[PDB]
């Protein structure tokens, strides 16, 4: 249900100054938030697919849901990541 | 590396959705990179409150303050007590 805490903590630590510290419950909080982020975006994409009578959540559905919900800035880096992923 | 995040766990979260039937191969891949972007931005915004309180330890209340202040985090409002 949650991404591994070690991975979440590593991303968090990379974001802040090298001398900063992160409390255990702050890492757990972000763990919860990023599952909610996935669920929130997925809900937008899934209702759209249901309205269009489509059975598969595609990558375009996820990207479009992100654009609709205020995460349009993610679209370009995600496309580059996925394209280098499948290259 | 972002590729290290487990796709099976991302797919499991996605499958909790009541209207999800089938998921493309690329959807969890996109969410892995999105998770990195989201964690980084949320952490940086919470860290504003850490430093504003003259602290060097990021605390859960710093994340809650960032959630309440920023529109991109509106969807997290029910996580805040």
């Amino acid at each position: 249900i949650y991404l591994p805490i070690a991975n979440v903590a590593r991303i968090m630590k990379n974001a802040i100054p090298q001398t900063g510290k992160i409390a255990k419950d702050a890492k757990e909080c972000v763990q919860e938030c990023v599952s909610e982020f996935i669920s929130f975006i997925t809900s937008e994409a899934s209702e759209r697919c249901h309205q269009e009578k489509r059975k598969t959540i595609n990558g375009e559905d996820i990207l479009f849901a992100m654009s609709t919900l205020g995460f349009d800035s993610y679209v370009e880096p995600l496309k580059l990541y996925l394209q280098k992923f499948r290259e | 590396r972002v590729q290290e995040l487990p796709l099976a766990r991302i797919k499991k979260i996605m499958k909790l959705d009541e209207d999800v039937k089938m998921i493309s191969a690329e959807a969890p891949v996109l969410f892995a990179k999105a998770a990195q972007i989201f964690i980084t931005e949320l952490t940086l915004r919470a860290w504003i409150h850490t430093e504003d309180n003259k602290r060097r330890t990021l605390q859960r209340n710093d994340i809650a303050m960032a959630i309440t202040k920023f529109d991109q985090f509106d969807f997290l409002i029910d996580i805040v007590p």
């Binding site: 669920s39 929130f40 809900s43 937008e44 209702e47 609709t68 919900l69 205020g70 | 009541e18 529109d71 509106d74 969807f75 409002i77 029910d78």
Partner: peptide
């Protein structure tokens, strides 16, 4: 931009 999806997530329950 998020309000209606936030609501709908509450409504689905």
């Amino acid at each position: 931009k998020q309000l209606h999806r936030i609501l709908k997530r509450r409504q689905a329950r």
